[PDB]
């Protein structure tokens, strides 16, 4: 694999990202949906022995970027605390993520274009099986707030080649357009993780 073609080196790395595969994404991004249907799960499963799969949501995209970040931060922290993989059938994050992708991209739902955040939140929480009250309580927790703080770094990473942005060890950003297969992507991630 070749620097400049398959990947690039971030001039400002994502901090505290040792042994991670970070995926910067947005619920509102059609390619994020496409790659999450086709490559994200299989590839992350293949490399789970070397790098921890670590979604980073980009809060600045779409009318409900902030709300989606809140829902995802809450659900990822809950899944992690329960020792549940983010690709597991029982992952609440996974359920919410695909509910938003289906609503936004397949059904063209826009929840009144920013003016109905309660409806947007409901879509994700209902799919995840979480109550509004539980979400509101969980959002106040330090770990959830820490996650939201970490994800602020998504904006500067997204500038390079858009979203999705798959990053190895906070340093090596894969060029999404170069990804040709599950195997090749997993091969690349392993090479990058050995650097
Ligand atoms: Cl779109
Ligand atoms: Cl994800
Ligand atoms: Cl759409
Ligand atoms: Cl609605
Ligand atoms: Cl819109
Ligand atoms: Cl900036
Ligand atoms: Cl091979």
CSV table of C-alpha atoms and ligand atoms in Angstrom, one decimal:
chain,number,residue,atom,x,y,z
A,1,UNK,CA,0.0,0.0,0.0
A,2,UNK,CA,1.1,3.6,-0.8
A,3,UNK,CA,1.0,6.8,1.2
A,4,UNK,CA,-0.9,9.4,-0.9
A,5,UNK,CA,-3.1,6.7,-2.6
A,6,UNK,CA,-4.3,4.3,0.0
A,7,UNK,CA,-3.9,6.5,3.1
A,8,UNK,CA,-2.4,9.7,4.4
A,9,UNK,CA,-0.8,10.8,7.7
A,10,UNK,CA,-2.8,13.3,9.7
A,11,UNK,CA,-0.7,16.4,10.6
A,12,UNK,CA,-2.8,16.7,13.7
A,13,UNK,CA,-3.5,13.2,15.0
A,14,UNK,CA,-6.5,12.3,17.1
A,15,UNK,CA,-5.2,12.1,20.7
A,16,UNK,CA,-5.5,9.1,23.1
A,17,UNK,CA,-6.2,6.7,20.2
A,18,UNK,CA,-3.7,3.9,20.7
A,19,UNK,CA,-4.8,0.6,19.2
A,20,UNK,CA,-8.0,2.0,17.7
A,21,UNK,CA,-9.8,2.0,14.4
A,22,UNK,CA,-11.7,5.2,14.5
A,23,UNK,CA,-14.5,5.7,12.0
A,24,UNK,CA,-15.6,9.3,11.7
A,25,UNK,CA,-19.2,9.3,10.3
A,26,UNK,CA,-22.5,11.2,10.1
A,27,UNK,CA,-26.0,9.8,10.1
A,28,UNK,CA,-26.7,12.1,7.1
A,29,UNK,CA,-23.9,10.8,4.9
A,30,UNK,CA,-25.0,8.4,2.2
A,31,UNK,CA,-21.5,6.8,1.8
A,32,UNK,CA,-21.3,6.3,5.6
A,33,UNK,CA,-24.5,4.2,5.2
A,34,UNK,CA,-23.1,2.4,2.2
A,35,UNK,CA,-19.8,1.4,3.8
A,36,UNK,CA,-21.6,0.5,7.1
A,37,UNK,CA,-23.8,-1.9,5.1
A,38,UNK,CA,-20.9,-3.4,3.2
A,39,UNK,CA,-17.5,-3.1,4.9
A,40,UNK,CA,-17.5,-1.7,8.5
A,41,UNK,CA,-18.6,-4.7,10.4
A,42,UNK,CA,-16.7,-7.4,8.6
A,43,UNK,CA,-13.5,-5.4,8.5
A,44,UNK,CA,-13.7,-4.3,12.2
A,45,UNK,CA,-14.4,-7.9,13.2
A,46,UNK,CA,-11.3,-9.1,11.3
A,47,UNK,CA,-9.0,-6.6,13.1
A,48,UNK,CA,-10.5,-6.6,16.6
A,49,UNK,CA,-7.4,-8.5,17.9
A,50,UNK,CA,-5.2,-5.5,17.1
A,51,UNK,CA,-7.5,-2.4,17.2
A,52,UNK,CA,-10.7,-1.4,19.0
A,53,UNK,CA,-13.5,-0.2,16.8
A,54,UNK,CA,-14.3,3.4,17.8
A,55,UNK,CA,-17.1,5.4,16.1
A,56,UNK,CA,-16.7,9.2,16.1
A,57,UNK,CA,-19.8,11.1,15.1
A,58,UNK,CA,-19.5,14.4,13.2
A,59,UNK,CA,-22.0,16.8,14.9
A,60,UNK,CA,-21.8,19.5,12.3
A,61,UNK,CA,-23.5,17.7,9.4
A,62,UNK,CA,-27.2,17.7,9.0
A,63,UNK,CA,-29.9,19.4,10.9
A,64,UNK,CA,-29.7,17.0,13.8
A,65,UNK,CA,-26.0,16.3,14.0
A,66,UNK,CA,-25.9,17.3,17.7
A,67,UNK,CA,-28.8,15.1,18.7
A,68,UNK,CA,-27.4,12.2,16.8
A,69,UNK,CA,-24.1,12.6,18.6
A,70,UNK,CA,-25.9,12.6,22.0
A,71,UNK,CA,-27.9,9.5,21.2
A,72,UNK,CA,-24.8,7.7,19.9
A,73,UNK,CA,-22.6,8.7,22.8
A,74,UNK,CA,-25.2,7.5,25.3
A,75,UNK,CA,-25.7,4.2,23.5
A,76,UNK,CA,-22.0,3.4,22.8
A,77,UNK,CA,-21.2,4.0,26.5
A,78,UNK,CA,-24.1,1.8,27.6
A,79,UNK,CA,-23.1,-1.0,25.2
A,80,UNK,CA,-19.4,-0.7,26.3
A,81,UNK,CA,-20.4,-0.9,30.0
A,82,UNK,CA,-22.4,-4.0,29.3
A,83,UNK,CA,-19.5,-5.6,27.4
A,84,UNK,CA,-21.6,-5.6,24.2
A,85,UNK,CA,-19.8,-5.3,20.8
A,86,UNK,CA,-21.1,-2.5,18.6
A,87,UNK,CA,-21.9,-5.0,15.9
A,88,UNK,CA,-23.7,-7.4,18.1
A,89,UNK,CA,-27.4,-8.1,17.5
A,90,UNK,CA,-28.0,-6.7,21.0
A,91,UNK,CA,-26.1,-3.4,20.5
A,92,UNK,CA,-28.3,-0.5,21.2
A,93,UNK,CA,-26.0,1.8,19.3
A,94,UNK,CA,-26.2,-0.4,16.2
A,95,UNK,CA,-30.0,-0.3,16.4
A,96,UNK,CA,-30.2,3.5,16.6
A,97,UNK,CA,-27.5,4.0,13.9
A,98,UNK,CA,-29.4,1.9,11.4
A,99,UNK,CA,-32.7,3.4,12.3
A,100,UNK,CA,-31.3,6.8,11.5
A,101,UNK,CA,-29.7,5.7,8.3
A,102,UNK,CA,-33.0,4.1,7.2
A,103,UNK,CA,-35.1,7.0,8.2
A,104,UNK,CA,-32.9,9.7,6.6
A,105,UNK,CA,-31.7,7.9,3.5
A,106,UNK,CA,-34.4,5.3,2.7
A,107,UNK,CA,-37.5,7.1,3.9
A,108,UNK,CA,-36.3,10.7,3.4
A,109,UNK,CA,-37.4,11.6,6.9
A,110,UNK,CA,-36.3,15.1,8.0
A,111,UNK,CA,-38.3,15.5,11.2
A,112,UNK,CA,-39.4,19.1,10.4
A,113,UNK,CA,-36.0,20.2,9.4
A,114,UNK,CA,-34.4,20.9,12.8
A,115,UNK,CA,-37.5,22.1,14.5
A,116,UNK,CA,-38.5,18.8,16.1
A,117,UNK,CA,-35.5,17.4,17.9
A,118,UNK,CA,-37.8,15.3,20.2
A,119,UNK,CA,-39.1,13.4,17.1
A,120,UNK,CA,-35.5,12.9,15.9
A,121,UNK,CA,-34.4,11.6,19.3
A,122,UNK,CA,-37.5,9.3,19.5
A,123,UNK,CA,-36.6,7.6,16.2
A,124,UNK,CA,-33.2,6.5,17.6
A,125,UNK,CA,-34.3,5.7,21.2
A,126,UNK,CA,-37.4,3.7,20.1
A,127,UNK,CA,-35.2,1.6,17.8
A,128,UNK,CA,-32.7,1.1,20.6
A,129,UNK,CA,-35.4,0.3,23.2
A,130,UNK,CA,-34.3,3.1,25.5
A,131,UNK,CA,-36.8,5.5,27.2
A,132,UNK,CA,-36.5,9.2,26.9
A,133,UNK,CA,-36.1,9.5,30.6
A,134,UNK,CA,-33.2,7.1,30.6
A,135,UNK,CA,-31.5,8.9,27.7
A,136,UNK,CA,-31.8,12.2,29.5
A,137,UNK,CA,-30.3,10.8,32.7
A,138,UNK,CA,-27.4,9.1,30.8
A,139,UNK,CA,-26.5,12.2,28.8
A,140,UNK,CA,-25.6,13.9,32.1
A,141,UNK,CA,-22.9,11.3,32.9
A,142,UNK,CA,-19.2,12.3,32.8
A,143,UNK,CA,-18.3,9.4,30.5
A,144,UNK,CA,-20.9,10.4,27.9
A,145,UNK,CA,-19.8,14.1,28.1
A,146,UNK,CA,-16.2,12.9,27.7
A,147,UNK,CA,-17.1,11.0,24.5
A,148,UNK,CA,-18.9,14.1,23.1
A,149,UNK,CA,-15.7,16.1,23.8
A,150,UNK,CA,-13.5,13.6,22.0
A,151,UNK,CA,-15.8,13.6,19.0
A,152,UNK,CA,-15.1,17.4,18.5
A,153,UNK,CA,-12.0,16.2,16.6
A,154,UNK,CA,-14.2,14.8,13.9
A,155,UNK,CA,-14.6,18.2,12.2
A,156,UNK,CA,-10.9,18.6,11.3
A,157,UNK,CA,-10.5,15.0,10.3
A,158,UNK,CA,-13.6,15.2,8.0
A,159,UNK,CA,-11.9,18.1,6.0
A,160,UNK,CA,-9.3,15.9,4.4
A,161,UNK,CA,-11.5,13.5,2.3
A,162,UNK,CA,-15.0,13.8,3.8
A,163,UNK,CA,-16.8,11.1,5.7
A,164,UNK,CA,-16.6,8.2,6.3
A,165,UNK,CA,-13.0,8.6,7.7
A,166,UNK,CA,-11.3,5.5,8.9
A,167,UNK,CA,-8.3,6.3,11.1
A,168,UNK,CA,-5.8,3.8,12.5
A,169,UNK,CA,-4.2,4.7,15.8
A,170,UNK,CA,-5.3,8.3,15.5
A,171,UNK,CA,-2.6,8.9,12.9
A,172,UNK,CA,-3.3,7.1,9.6
A,173,UNK,CA,-6.3,8.2,7.6
A,174,UNK,CA,-7.5,5.7,4.9
A,175,UNK,CA,-8.6,7.2,1.6
A,176,UNK,CA,-12.2,5.9,1.4
A,177,UNK,CA,-12.2,6.0,-2.4
A,178,UNK,CA,-9.2,3.5,-2.5
A,179,UNK,CA,-11.2,0.8,-0.6
A,180,UNK,CA,-11.9,-2.1,-3.0
A,181,UNK,CA,-12.7,-5.0,-0.7
A,182,UNK,CA,-13.1,-6.2,2.9
A,183,UNK,CA,-9.9,-8.2,2.6
A,184,UNK,CA,-7.8,-5.3,1.2
A,185,UNK,CA,-9.1,-2.9,3.8
A,186,UNK,CA,-8.3,-5.3,6.6
A,187,UNK,CA,-4.8,-5.9,5.1
A,188,UNK,CA,-4.2,-2.1,5.0
A,189,UNK,CA,-5.4,-1.6,8.6
A,190,UNK,CA,-3.0,-4.3,9.8
A,191,UNK,CA,-0.1,-2.7,7.9
A,192,UNK,CA,-0.9,0.7,9.3
A,193,UNK,CA,-1.3,-0.7,12.9
A,194,UNK,CA,2.2,-2.2,12.6
A,195,UNK,CA,3.8,1.2,12.0
B,1,LIG,CL1,-27.8,11.8,1.1
B,2,LIG,CL1,-20.3,3.0,13.5
B,3,LIG,CL1,-31.5,11.1,1.3
B,4,LIG,CL1,-41.4,13.3,12.2
B,5,LIG,CL1,-32.2,18.6,4.9
B,6,LIG,CL1,-11.2,24.9,12.0
B,7,LIG,CL1,-4.7,-11.5,0.3
